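Q: What changes when magnesium ion is included in the input?
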Amino acid sequence: VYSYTEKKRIRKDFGKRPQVLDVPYLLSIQLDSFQKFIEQDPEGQYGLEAAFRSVFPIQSYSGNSELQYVSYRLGEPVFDVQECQIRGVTYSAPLRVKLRLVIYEREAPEGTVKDIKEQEVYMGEIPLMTDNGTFVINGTERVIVSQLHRSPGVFFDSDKGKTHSSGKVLYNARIIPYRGSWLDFEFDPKDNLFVRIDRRRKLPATIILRALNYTTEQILDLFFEKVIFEIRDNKLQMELVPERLRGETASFDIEANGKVYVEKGRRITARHIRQLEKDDVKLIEVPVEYIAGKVVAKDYIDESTGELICAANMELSLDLLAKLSQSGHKRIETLFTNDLDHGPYISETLRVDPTNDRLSALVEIYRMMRPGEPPTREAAESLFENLFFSEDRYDLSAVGRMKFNRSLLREEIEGSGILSKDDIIDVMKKLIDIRNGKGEVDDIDHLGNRRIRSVGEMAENQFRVGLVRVERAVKERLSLGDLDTLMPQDMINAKPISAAVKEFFGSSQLSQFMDQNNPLSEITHKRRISALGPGGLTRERAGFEVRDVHPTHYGRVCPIETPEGPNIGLINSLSVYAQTNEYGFLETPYRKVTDGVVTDEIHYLSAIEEGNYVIAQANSNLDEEGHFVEDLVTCRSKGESSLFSRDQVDYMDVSTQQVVSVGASLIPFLEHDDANRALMGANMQRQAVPTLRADKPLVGTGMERAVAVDSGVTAVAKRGGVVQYVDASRIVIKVNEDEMYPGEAGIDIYNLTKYTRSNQNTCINQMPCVSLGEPVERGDVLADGPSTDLGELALGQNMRVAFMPWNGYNFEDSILVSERVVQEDRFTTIHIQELACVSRDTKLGPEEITADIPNVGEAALSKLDESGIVYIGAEVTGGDILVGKVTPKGETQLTPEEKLLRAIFGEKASDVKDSSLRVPNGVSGTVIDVQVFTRDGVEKDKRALEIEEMQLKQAKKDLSEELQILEAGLFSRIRAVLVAGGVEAEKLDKLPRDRWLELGLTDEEKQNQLEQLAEQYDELKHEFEKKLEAKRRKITQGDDLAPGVLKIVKVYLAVKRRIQPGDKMAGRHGNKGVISKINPIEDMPYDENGTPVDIVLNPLGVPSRMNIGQILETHLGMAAKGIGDKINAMLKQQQEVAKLREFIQRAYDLGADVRQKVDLSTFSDEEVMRLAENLRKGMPIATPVFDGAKEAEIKELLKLGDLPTSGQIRLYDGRTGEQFERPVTVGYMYMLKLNHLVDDKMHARSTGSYSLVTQQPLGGKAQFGGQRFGEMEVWALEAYGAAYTLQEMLTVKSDDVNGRTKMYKNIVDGNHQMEPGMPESFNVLLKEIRSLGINIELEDE
Amino acid sequence: PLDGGRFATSDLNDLYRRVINRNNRLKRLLDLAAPDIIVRNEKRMLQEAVDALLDNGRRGRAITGSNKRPLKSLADMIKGKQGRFRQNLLGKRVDYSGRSVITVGPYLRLHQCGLPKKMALELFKPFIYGKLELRGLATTIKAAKKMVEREEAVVWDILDEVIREHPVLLNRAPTLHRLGIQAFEPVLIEGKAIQLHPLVCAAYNADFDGDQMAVHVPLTLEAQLEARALMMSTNNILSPANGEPIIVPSQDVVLGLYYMTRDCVNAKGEGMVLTGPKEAERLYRSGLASLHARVKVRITEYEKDANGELVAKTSLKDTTVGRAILWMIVPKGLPYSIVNQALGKKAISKMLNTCYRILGLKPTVIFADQIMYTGFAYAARSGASVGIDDMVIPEKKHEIISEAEAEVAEIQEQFQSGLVTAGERYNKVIDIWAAANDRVSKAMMDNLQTETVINRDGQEEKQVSFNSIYMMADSGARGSAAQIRQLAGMRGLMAKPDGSIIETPITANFREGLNVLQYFISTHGARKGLADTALKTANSGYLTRRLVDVAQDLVV
Amino acid sequence: ERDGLFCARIFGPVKDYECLCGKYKRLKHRGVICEKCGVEVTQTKVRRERM
RNA sequence: UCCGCGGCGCG
DNA sequence: CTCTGAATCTCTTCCGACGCGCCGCGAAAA
Ligand SMILES: [Mg+2]
Ligand SMILES: [Zn+2]
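A: The predicted holo structure follows.
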């Protein structure tokens, strides 16, 4: 079954793959995060309570005073989002925190408290999230783009051999904590191991090992493997493990237990190892030469004198062996090392480190991390311990701990947030293994090592920083102040935390302006995932390795939406079905497979888990219970493509729409065009401009409904029912009988945004789209927004397009457009700019706005009102005055003779100058609104009273309708009670409402109910009274303007823009284009039926772009309108409903085993009439992205509509009249209009203002500045010669004031002679160098 | 100054005030004869303050303001892209400039560009004032500004008068080569977009994708003479990098020429003998004979003698009537044999170069203009267009893919049996897939290139096919073999970003539906190419700047 | 200010051919240093020259 | 109003 | 066994297109 709104216009589908999981709410990634950031939580793993538990309690370091936290509460915001934006302030809520201060007795224990104080401290403001997922911070609308930062943890990466010669690879291990200093271990080409901190100077590694309570020998025991030697009768014996001889050449004999056998000069083959194993050889005897060159493992001390000989790491020799034998050590311990395994690297590091004990290593690290200051025992110890092994400065967050434990294959999934010594030893071990070859590096950009950090986490971190600031503040307060004559609000200070929050939400790089061109822009901006910002990486250093699409991006980041330009790859997008894991990794859904049969259960998998399994994708075909059709099924095993049996698959792709994001999923026929142009088209859809009228796309992808619904552009009825009142401004709905809250009015009201400025200066308007008495279900769209039709996204318009090189007008991607579309206004748009004028307290009187203005013509004044503000509805041109403001000049004293001369000349010598606001040059339009604001206590003029008065009557009529509804409900209850007993319903209806309230029902329980209803009437009366009076207070009150400003005025200028030659015009699939010709309607080609073609595209784009989607769409569109025409004609023929029901039923039934299966037999005749009314010129088609319409079905649709099957029809030239020799593709294309308006970019400067610093002309159209003749053009002129032109450029047209003045006089006089002169910029340079303390001067003067 | 009497402080002022504070404090401190520790600390503080004043940030942490910005010093104002040298001394912003979006002007000649009327008015306002004073209509410059603002009808006439021969320099940002700035003699058009002659769009490296470009006007007589002599597009038709001509017809014009010269074995009016190209024009414009008809016509050609005299000759020869139409616009010195071929971009380039090397510059300019017009005209009359049915899929494809499927399957089994190694199997799988790709590409080209036709006697014949895509690619007008191969045949065996071939072929074509995994594999190369192309520009510009600054001194 | 970084005595007048104290306001006073205030009367261009 | 810095897109 | 020179290592410096367009916002200084 279908809903009423969908029943209005059902979009026919073609999808063959059955759908399982409905598209989730698109805005989750924002809303869920802020929910985690703002709601109460006792456990409080993450959030504001987590911050408070992480800072409070705070105790005086050696006092008997403590400050402990209880709870936090968020107050109701002063204004709603509409009030906030019209006022132009931050939509914030207060943080109310319950706080307790405790003071103990002096006697032990410390818990012997003696006094407590408790209260709720105000703790600044937090910007609150709006239901549509946006912030309102300064009246403006702002959004946060989530950051894809590198996950905290441990990474093992190689340089691949670029740094050193011979391609020798140098390995690095790096530890990234969630906050605090880093830690890197590196291998030098000399195979020595080094450590470094925060990319400071390199150090020997073991010093950090020595930094802890780890002497040399114990470190050796941890790191290496041991070998035992014994000397008896000048004979050397040692123990053996067969695996040790793997890889060693048999240079000497091997003998044991009277048995000698070895392949002298050869390698120890595995046969030798197995022979030794089966022989179970424990010890062998070796010559002196073998032990020569070996390295000892431990220190050895003789008791003959008390001396230490051959300390550990020292390499054995004949003298050492003689000394140890004569001293008496019969047991020798050494370490074992091979070139293939168990490298000697730690031994070399111990041979190279200058340090010898814990103190010396600590001294070294102090000397390394802070040059220029003296070492010192206590300070060095303190900074080391607080830097690494304390939560004060270091914390590997829980996700960091998880990643760490996973990397070093531990079992525990949770642990401490602070590093431990054994962890460092484990990292050393793993790095040594990697260098040995028994391990693998990890890809730095593997998406399992990137983490999506959302709004809540960033705000939490900033708030934590502010909290530690206020923590030191209160610490020193409690430390200094007396304990029993204060109260926490005295100790606290809201300014630091509020400043931190405001700075993060306003100025941070990841809080950019929220662009509001069209709802698709809304969705794609909120779902954008960036790698820039703090802790990320910068644009100018991002190599190609980060930017490339990794194979793990499947179903997690769309390859298509990513922007072109220097930001490519760094700004990804989130796929439709993906969602964020608890740890912040990316999840995607999958369907479990069993016994070669897929099933409807859904799993969510992260990247790393996905790596293990083997999964097949949606291109695979399923039947019956979902059993695989093909024997060998293609899958995505372990990050690579292959095929397997049915029995080997693990999970199946959730749907065909998995890989694509919203923006690219809106493109039809995506699987037919090259990725470059598909990417450009998906990106360029986002720049569509809402037209005055909207029309549905004939060829859609089925996502438009969902995208419009989730996007906040449209009004959605929160409760179903039947519509009670419809108006262009407001809509009133009556809820159902089963939907009302027990004891509720049952009526809901929405106010529609009529005409307001967008964030990008475009137009935001809403249109009611329901009829009177129309049933409404929940979730139904009740007010179409911009670029929306009946709840369907409609960016552009449908136009009749033909492909042919009609003349030179299509030379490179140049579109030639019929005047017919200009006359129909199919592409007109509306733009709204804003202007402001500010009043500030100037000396000798502040600036004043007034009707009177000197040196201005009478007509201009007549445009202004008596207050000095233009009347609403007055057209204005460029340079006209809008707000008449004057400013005192100051003293401006003049001599009596000069004053008399000024009086003789006229009304001159006045101390007041003009400061009125004018239209920007080239701007024109009509005025739609004037907003005024004024500091409290300053008088409000008649005009401001006027706007406030309209506001108050609007509020009063809203609340009056509210009270009439509530009176209707309450008196309906009164009448029902009367009917239930003591019925006087006829008299009650006849009598006025006072008689309804006054009736006493003989003191029954029904009379008690009547009294309760009278009390309800009373309380609602006072409630409405107080709310209305509060509204009067907030309207009448002053404004919190900027300091020094008494009052401001803002005027809104609206203009209507049309298609103009040179304007840009979009077609999805990356078919860019500039409009290059508007032709009279009689010149364009036409078909045999006389219908002209609106747009003539250049065919030459298609073969080189491989945008073969667009041609397909064109053909498909040709079928769609065809059906429409018949339906249209069949409505004009006014024939029977049943036969048209038959026709439309056939049209829907044409799909070959499509899923929709609509049955019109269930539609009442009114429904069919309405559908046909919408279906006139329509027949929309939905083609899923990779489950789209096969060409055969499009041919069948074409033949149903009686169009020629080939899709190419004959045309006639408008001016010549004979047929074009070959048939020409004619069809229907969805074309968009882009924000790059040609009349905005066109600009011409000539003469104007000059920059004060260097006398050069300004830059920028807004300030009427000239173009820039950059160095490229300088060389261009240099090559041609043309030296005179270059000199003219530099000396007159740019810099030399004297020369350019003389030249201007010459040109006015008609003489065109050059007058060269020294550029003033060079003089500037001369002076600047002369400031450096350098003599520079001209020579031979 | 700022609103309300407030001020914004130039960075130098803060550093100077710091130095003044420290110096005055040190002076008053020395006056009081305090112990050496205080004066030494104060004087070292003054030293660091003046260090910041001169070259803030060179040593230690730069002093910063309340905006946590590193304050600019005197030294920082000279060094860098934003410094005085690069930003100001070179590349001074100029008056009398405008910028606008471009639009194809087909009706233009080679050297005149279309200019929006409003831009012309603004740019030439000094000249409008001058001529208005000359004719005495405006008694004062105030009056001139009035009438020029009042757009009195005389003002437009004066504007046409002044621009009669005054060329304008026209640049497209960014200039990459000396052909990036050219001068045109303007004409006035309505609207707000600069009309450009189609030919020079190749030289400017413009693509008419909403790209903007700027206009300047010379002022001195000298500069106007340099413009007309040196920078005029009619000159400098040969690039300085290499002698190859830069004005080369491409895209629509090439398509029109190729479609015009092509022959068809059977056509209306074929076989008839016609006196001359004039009557060929009569025949075709009367619709009595198709463009591709092969006929016998009389032609005449001329050649320079030892003295350069154009000795004439004439005869009857076979010709397609379209090529006969072409012979009208040829200059008087060209030999006929050049036109007698299936014209393509390479051929047309050789043709224009030929007439440049044989005849003077004016014949070549006129010939280029006329070939431009005629190419557009007959391409228009052609109606050549692309349809969904054009990318015909060869029936052999299913067979070839079947064979390759078997070959890979058996090879995989052989690898599973231990007969071959993973790398060896990888290599031979790549080899067999490449062979399959070659087979299918060859078969598809063979099917596309030729069509079956009927002769005068009804007998089966074969000719070069008239399928739209084939003629688009063959002519060289915005296409090549690779793209048409990808249109309907195999897409190939491209590689992962690491360069390894994925060993799983991209099977379907774009007319067919690329499967999800297939397309997602296909996107890796696209992303890599786009990123590389975007990032290369920085290094290319830098390398150019260094090279220019090394070679700027030389002059013959 | 009297002796600041913009001192009229040092870097010249604040307006073309106008003394700081307004004693002289005619072009005939060119090159005259006002006795009352001590500021040379000349073009404001010297504010770009004098260091 | 003309100043400076950061972010975003276009070519 | 010691001294000097030569060579490497360690640190510091410089610098990665350009033209716009758009947007917003400065202050313990007055
Ligand atoms: Mg371009
Ligand atoms: Zn004076």
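Observations recorded in class: Residues 828-938+1039-1057 of chain A form a domain with the OB fold (Dihydrolipoamide Acetyltransferase, E2P) fold (CATH 2.40.50.150).
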